[PDB]
Model the fold of this input.
Amino acid sequence: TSDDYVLRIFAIAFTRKQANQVKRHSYAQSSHIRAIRKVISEILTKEVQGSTLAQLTSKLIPEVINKEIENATKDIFPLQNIHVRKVKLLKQPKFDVGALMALHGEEKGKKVT
Amino acid sequence: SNIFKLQIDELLEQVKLKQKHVLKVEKFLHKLYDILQEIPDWEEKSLAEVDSFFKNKIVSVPFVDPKPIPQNTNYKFNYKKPDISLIGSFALKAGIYQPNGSSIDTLLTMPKELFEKKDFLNFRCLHKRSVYLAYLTHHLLILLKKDKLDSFLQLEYSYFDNDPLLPILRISCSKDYNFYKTRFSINLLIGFPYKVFEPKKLLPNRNCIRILPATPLYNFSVLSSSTHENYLKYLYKTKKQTESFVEATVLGRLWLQQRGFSSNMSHSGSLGGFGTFEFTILMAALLNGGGINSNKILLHGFSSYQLFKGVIKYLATMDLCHDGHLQFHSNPASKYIDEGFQTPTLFDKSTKVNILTKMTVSSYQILKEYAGETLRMLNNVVQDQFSNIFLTNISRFDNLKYDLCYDVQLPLGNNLETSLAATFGSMERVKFITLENFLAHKITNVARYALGDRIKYIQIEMVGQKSDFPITKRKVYSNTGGNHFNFDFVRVKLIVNPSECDKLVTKGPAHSETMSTEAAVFKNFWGIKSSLRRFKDGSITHCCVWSTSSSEPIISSIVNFALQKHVSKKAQISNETIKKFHNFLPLPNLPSSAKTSVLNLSSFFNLKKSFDDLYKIIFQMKLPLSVKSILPVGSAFRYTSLCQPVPFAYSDPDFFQDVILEFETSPKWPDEITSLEKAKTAFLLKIQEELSANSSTYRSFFSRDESIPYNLEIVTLNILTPEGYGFKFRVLTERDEILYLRAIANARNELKPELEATFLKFTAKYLASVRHTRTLENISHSYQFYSPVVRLFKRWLDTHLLLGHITDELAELIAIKPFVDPAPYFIPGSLENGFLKVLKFISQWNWKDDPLILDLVKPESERLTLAQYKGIQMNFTNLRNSDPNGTHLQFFVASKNDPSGILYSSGIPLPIATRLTALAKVAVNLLQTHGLNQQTINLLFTPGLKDYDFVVDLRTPIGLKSSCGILSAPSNFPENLNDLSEKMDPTYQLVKYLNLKYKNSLILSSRKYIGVNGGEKGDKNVITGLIKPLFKGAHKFRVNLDCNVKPVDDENVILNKEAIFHEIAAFGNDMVINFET
Amino acid sequence: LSLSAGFDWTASILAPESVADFERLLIGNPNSSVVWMNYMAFQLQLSEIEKARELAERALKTINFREEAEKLNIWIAMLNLENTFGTEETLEEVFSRACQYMDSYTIHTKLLGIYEISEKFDKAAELFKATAKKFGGEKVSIWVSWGDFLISHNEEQEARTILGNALKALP
Amino acid sequence: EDISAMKNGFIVVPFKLPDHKALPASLHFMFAKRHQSSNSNESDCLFLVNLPLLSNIEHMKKFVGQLCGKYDTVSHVEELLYNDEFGLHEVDLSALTSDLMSSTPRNTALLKFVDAASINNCWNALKKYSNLHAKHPNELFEWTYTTPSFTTFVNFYKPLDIDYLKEDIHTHMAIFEQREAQAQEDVQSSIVDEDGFTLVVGKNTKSLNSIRKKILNKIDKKAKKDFYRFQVRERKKQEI
Ligand SMILES: Nc1ncnc2c1ncn2[C@@H]1O[C@H](COP(=O)(O)OP(=O)(O)OP(=O)(O)O)[C@@H](O)[C@H]1O
Ligand SMILES: [Mg+2]
Done:
């Protein structure tokens, strides 16, 4: 990320049949899969690089990423059930308490006597 | 590396002393050496007899305090011929040209027979030394008269390394034997012979002053005086063994001087004790080992850079004071011991001396950070660091070198108060030879304990201390001192820790059934201020509580209390410089504003929370396209808005925080630019319409925007949050970018530069802006003081009518330079320190020949690499090639977010750029001439206003200072949103609209923030002008003149200054009041 | 009191005979082609053709885009520069670049006079043939200027032929 | 003051200026000349230099009328062309980015009249109105500096009329879809040149203009080094 958070994402998608399709199956040639896979990898790379971890998680909740993928891959091959399957956190920067407080939006004791 | 080697050689030759001046001096001292041998011997004398002998002479024996009394001076005195010798740098031929001047050390070995084996007790030897110095001075004086050299040589006493126990005679030449042009001064050291006193009895732990407590300083004074030639012989051997010694020695001397270090004593309070000699010895210790396994850390084959780096690396990492020390042998391999003596130590087991006694712990600690600081710089590969390491002075201003400075005026300062003086006592006299040495330690301990973790580095300096006195006086005389105390006042300088500096409790030891030693001292130290408290964690610990103020830091309160309780109850602690700067920062009209510390950003957090509530609403609203992302890009989101956001204060310019709205990619957008704009509005209509129905509590209205030239259809939605905040909405479309590029392509060649400027503003506002606010928001968390200093900096620009042209973005990128690139200084830790550094940089920054490129990264990935760096460097050279004078572009500010560098600095007229440089130069010059005091700083923040050709005085109907949330106040938004204008200040738009009309002829400037810089009521603002040189003079009449003129002849016209006065007067309507020309 | 600094308008705070003098003049006179031409001619006198070209590009950009008359001077100077000190290819590049920015027919006229002044008659005859073919159907001046050239070089019959071609092409 | 005309023909047309408290007989001068251009829209115009601030057609209407009364001439001003005070309307960004919906000096504008009888009448007055400053400066006219447009310009921070904005969007989009619909048919309609060449229009292309722009914007690997007897023979030659 832009925060020096090294993370790994898993994106999963499925092929679908068009409205008027008659063939039982909807298999995609490997040329489409590698083309689609290249586009999905680009989009994930673009978003995470151009975002913070706090911003990134704000993307996950509304699943705007899944909608971006669908539009990008719409020309190559129609798809369905596109999701970000998983997000792994490999490495973390030096802990910055100042940031942690800001993400969450000091206090005095009571004289004990 | 090769560039570094050539740079080093270029430095060495530049500082290389001119050999002719060497010969001029050797010609003298050799002749002087004949004079010394002329000096006649003397017989045994008692203190009464010598007192009579010197009773009427002009010379006065400079006895060391306490002066010998008749009872204890039963031992006699005598003078014999010495063994003259030359020591110091000049012996090793490692001196360099110093504009201030250098010193030639000549050691005079008193013959051994003038001593008893037990002369190292109770100042016995120091007395014998003092008279022997006195006898030489008198006889040298008359012999100097005999040879008629007395005409141009001035004789005075002084202290060696500011050691009060070691007065010396100094020879200097005022304007054939005249060596004034050489800029050298001869110093006559009266040292003892080697091994006169058992060095075991002179070890630091032992004592030599009967009163038992140890006497490290007095032990060091005698023992070192007996070991001078030995260290010359030791250093002399190494210079033979390694060919790279001398140029290694000069470099360190250069480095040390820039950081305000020296071999002068530090216990008195001045920073020093690490000089060339110690830097020279420390190599010779390393050249014979250095590691824990006694293995060699520096090889004789090492070059200059390699020897230097090893020592810097050695100091930076291995510790010599708290845990571990280095012992070596002059006459056996050097080895690093784990055990530490809790003081900066470097034994010489051969001689049983500690070379670092003169080093203070506070000074030693700072020396490491500089050592650690450069070692990072030295390992840097991306940027050249030679100019910063060696050719930059940080010690010119203490304030730039220290975050906070306090001056404590002690009481009764012709002799110090009896109460405080009684604290000196006999015991501490034995431990600490002088009161100044003692009192500096008293201040630092209590200052160190009280501030605790709030500070990193502390220095206590005895301001106005002298070290040289005329031959007719026995000790130094200060006008305040009256021979009692060689100082005027004490200044406390601190390197603060921004993380915990503003901590509102000073935590302490945790409670226990039986009061522990650590607990006891805490309760004694703070006394009544000490309290035993519990927290909501459930912990019970002793802690004392303070109060923040928006005027001064918690540290000011602590030190003020801390000193008065223990040092002296009459002390007066003051820092008016820091206080005034804090005041200049606008004070928000929020609850409990006065008690808020400037490091508090809570006002911004409330705005972000206010955004978040609206952020949820937009997403769940249904639209033809899903909302891809809503990105805040407003000033207040990055902690850089000038005045903290205040609810409902809608007169402030930065009230409406922009937000970027991006929809999902679609192919159905209009292909034409205007249709794209009107498509974007149509959503803001739907967003506005739906928002009104579902959440009627919010309010909305529309406003046009004209920042982007020629894109006149852009419309924005303003949302007024019930919490009391405003937001502006603008839509970003993927097709939007490529439509501009299409515009540049199809434009005629003459017009391509103009359209490029339009695209440049766009990428600045939509595309680059998102990256900026992200990077600046995150990085601010590690640099706490960034938000204040940049705001106060923006304030300073506004008072002088610069924020009108300097785009706000350029203000941040310049202001962040001291933080990301603190070298050679430290990271700013206080408001005075940060702001000046921004001014120091601009003053010395040569924007025609040097680009500014910043690594917007947190303190030590995302650093610039070699390839990226060489890429940006090439951009500047390509740019300057077409624009050598820098007319079209002045400031090159680039980073990853903008490798181009022209995005945030295009369009600034050259006159404005020079002013920001000219004013910066004037400001720093003023500080050098007049120190930082209340008067100087007021000048910094008042505008000259006289250079502008004509000045128009402008006034608003109503005072806005309350409506800007500025506490010297509205509580709801007006019902009819048209009324918003009636509490606004349109001058900023007046100037912007004027400049376009008179771009070729006039450059007008106005105060954007009227509430802050508009007087008490925040309603006084000024429009200042300038006439370009071409139109200042008459010009032949032509159609393309394109400026408002008046005729003089058939084909001659002149600028119609009087007409322009009306057109300015027309815009303001009632607002314009008075004109000056 | 106040901090006050004189307004510095040549960046100093940071007849012409030197680079500094010409650059200093251009500070206040960016739209004067004469100053640019004088600076260019100074470099050419110094045999600094490569630098003289570099100044030409700056003059083309630095001068305000509305000052067509000033721009026309710069391009004409470049045409003389390449004609005198340049090769055939570079002159064609500037010539083709010149027609791109300004009135195409006018630049044909200026290069044509330049050839006549330099007495490159053989090239001058050819450029009429290109000029007349492109603009002959609309401009009577090119045909008249051709007839002057042929008559000036004692070719009366060729002038009669050109006049016949002129009548054929012109409305 | 004695001057009445610039030798290049620009007649000076002095005026008096208003009175305001901030500045306690200051004059603003305009230089005018007859404009000649074959272009019909630019015909019957008066070229003007150094216009007063924010001078719209209404200001001229006051001035031409104030001229009409004193010299009993009938002159009607039609419109003010090329009046761009701030340089906001130099480049029409709509024209550059596409052809649909837009088929397309400084401190000066062109002042068009209704007919030639008006402009020559006004010009003859302008010659007279020039002579006044030499003789009787006191009767010089006064530029109001204030008109309905001036008030609208001044009020910078004014919310737009949501009712107005919606109708501007509505007509603007309705026209664009028609133009977009009209073009897209033309590209994909089997274009045929007179000599029976069928233009090749891809699917998804929308406008003939974009086709034109694409056109304007825009063996060695298969050769064998040793295939013919001369090549190897040449290789034999270099080998020895
Ligand atoms: N800390 C010390 N411990 C022991 N002896 C010292 C110390 N500092 C200086 N001396 C002795 O004093 C002599 C001269 O001291 P000084 O510091 O002036 O030397 P230097 O390196 O020649 O100085 P400079 O920086 O003026 O060139 C040294 O040669 C050494 O004999
Ligand atoms: Mg020395």
In short: Residues 1-114 of chain D form one domain. Chains D and A do not touch (no CB pair under 8 Å). Residues 162-187 of chain D form the longest helix (26 residues).
